[PDB]
Recover the amino acids of this structure.
């Protein structure tokens, strides 16, 4: 539910950034002293960075699970500080 909305927003932001990079029509417009594509890429950076932080935390957890290390204290520390 909530995660689906975030994923859709991230996908939309990525598509908009790709369109702006490929198409120079949007580059012709600017606001706040900067090009619109730059601001769109920045906002997409914020949101997709939250999403990528979540994904990277999941990937790091998966890698630690596959790692040969099995220390109890390390597992608790990772769970607490993730």
């Amino acid at each position: 539910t909530l995660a689906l909305i975030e994923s859709a927003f991230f996908v939309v932001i990525l598509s908009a950034l790709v369109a702006s990079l490929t198409i120079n029509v949007l580059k012709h417009h600017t606001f706040w002293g900067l090009e619109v594509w730059k601001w769109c890429v920045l906002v997409m950076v914020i949101f997709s960075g939250m999403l990528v932080t979540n994904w990277f935390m999941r990937l790091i957890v998966f890698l630690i699970e596959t790692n040969f290390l099995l220390r109890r204290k390390v597992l608790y520390f990772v769970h607490g500080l993730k």
